[model samples]
Target: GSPEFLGEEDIPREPRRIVIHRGSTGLGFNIVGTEDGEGIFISFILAGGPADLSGELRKGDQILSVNGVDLRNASAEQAAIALKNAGQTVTIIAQYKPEEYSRFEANSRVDSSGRIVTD
Candidate 1:
């Protein structure tokens, strides 16, 4: 085996099934979507949260499906709903992606209606 240099471009694009059991902080992550229905992406992985502890998710990671519900074609709102309906334990098939935006663009929140709130 040879030592290969791994960078953002070298990151793989395979689907990852991450099982995250919600914590007191809730899902402990936010999701963002593109205008062209590209794919749903995970935002910040809150510190001390389930996703962070899972160690399989990262900011700006793309999610293909949530609980068997495809998110690739779903709107940001629909994806959020699907994620919320995923129950206490969530099964999401996601792909690792390099961060696209900075923290300023990632300032987001979820309301009681499970909608993404952004500035």
Candidate 2:
């Protein structure tokens, strides 16, 4: 049990796919990004929405792809549009990531601030 790590930040996790059906309420969750802008991440989940019900999606999870659309170089604007374009029963490919994920918390120093705080 002896190994080193790239601060565990550069590590990648297994891609998890969750088929979320959007009702009149939508997918019930939101996504943001890191300073890279291309790094899309799960922002939050509506308590009783399909996303929450799925129990697969969670905050801090980095979104890898959506409905076959690549997100590795997708901007926040593109990511938002991509998710929105994901029709009912869309498949979301996401993974768990720690560090620099811009977790929205009270004590953490604000990074981007405006956009994330709003949506």
Candidate 3:
């Protein structure tokens, strides 16, 4: 096998995305426990749902806070309650894991001019 692009060991990165989800009636998404089992995360987003329409939320994004309720140290049950009563409109602050350097290199092709070559 060809040498692996960029080794396997790489520090993970976190990127933030602040989304305003309208419609108090429904927010089509599923929440799950983080890998550490301490906090909750957005595991899935329903197509054509409010979250999907916003085009900001994505799977694997950690829900930092719901509205003004800080969930940094909240349990899955607590986070659920916060979301359940988040009023008609809610503000969500979430962070997603960014692409690692190795992953980026694997997807990119460089040209002689030092620019990315894409078809």
Candidate 4:
């Protein structure tokens, strides 16, 4: 299969919210803001990290705020700094980007010949 570039609004298969405590090493997630400079989003999550173990935050989830600080206009650098400086246990509020359907659900709409029905 060929690779395809994802559009801005497209979300990944699964998304989650995770908490990273202060002074905790290996926070395990990368952050990026939208092109328009809105809420920060999780770019990737490292396996075996606290976020991964919690099974909460996953890729493509928009981080609305960190420890009560709204990131509505924060830049990626700002968000990173804020996340880095959260002194106590920090709470990360996030939302998963909506998807049309789950992989399993998409399969249900396919033809009996194993091809997806576009029409």
Candidate 5:
């Protein structure tokens, strides 16, 4: 059996990627798009998920890539399908910044409930 887990703060390395958001749902939970034909990321932020807790990722981050593919012009279903086939974890890269705010990848997933499944 494993020893009882102990916790405090000074967390070690975070294997899963995390974005920041303040809305009821994490940015990963919403469909991203742009008038210029940008694509979307199948949001995997479980209700009240961490990504939303961070408050960095916003609703208008312009999801440009999903799991490393350009998402410009892709539909919500397309993004979700790709991520579903991609397996457990998919990275969501957003066009947040040009100079430094490059796309970021997060270890995300979804559940059977059609909601972002943060494992």
Candidate 6:
């Protein structure tokens, strides 16, 4: 199939503009659960949401820019604002996944210090 470019009128204004930092939407299920400790489970960053351009971005890498504006340490809200004002071709800089993304499960446990642990 050939890629078709769309004019502004043809583009969806709402073009999925929300980003989720955890979970992968491509998976049949968006999340994974596994146990290592009693009554235990873990939630890993499984997906990148609207901010990631519907999976264009990846998990693990921090969002560094929105439309070319750098958000070195900015919070999620701040990044969203930048994206809104950056206009089209929203440029997002992130470390991104090192390899193909796949659903992952982590075994969870509570450390002696009561800190949550995962594997």
Report the number of the highest-TM-score candidate: 2
Compared with the true structure, all predictions reach lDDT values of: 0.73, 0.72, 0.63, 0.62, 0.44, 0.36
| lDDT score for candidate 6 against the true structure | 0.36
lDDT of 2 by residue, 8-114 (tens): 33434578888888878688888776456658877788999988989888776788888989897787788888888888887988886634354544444322311
The CA lDDT at 50 in model 1 is 90
Off by over 4 Å in 2: 1-12, 34-36, 103-106, 109-119
Q: What is the lDDT of residue 37 in candidate 6?
A: 13
TM-score rank order: 2, 1, 3, 4, 5, 6
- Give the lDDT of residue 114 in candidate 5: 22
Per-residue CA lDDT of model 1 for 4-66, tens digit only, reads: 544323445577899999886578888887656667888778888898889888765788888
Residue-level lDDT tens digits of model 5 in 5-115: 433222222223333332432233555333444445323345566455554454324556656676667766676565455434445565432111122234433223322
What TM-score would candidate 5 get against the native?
0.41
Q: How many clashing pairs in candidate 1?
A: 0
User: Which lDDT tens digits does candidate 3 get at residues 26-108?
Assistant: 78887775334455667568888888888877655678888767887786777778887887677888875322111233354
After superposition on all CA atoms, how large is the RMSD of candidate 5? 13.5
Cα deviation in Å at residue 88, candidate 3? Answer: 1.4
What TM-score should be assigned to candidate 4? Answer: 0.61
For model 1, the stretches where C-alpha displacement exceeds 4 angstroms are 1-10, 99-119
lDDT minimum window of 10 residues, candidate 1? 97-106
Q: Every model's Cα RMSD, please?
A: 9.1, 8.0, 10.6, 10.8, 13.5, 15.7
Candidate 3: stretches off by over 4 Å: 1-17, 22-25, 34-37, 98-119
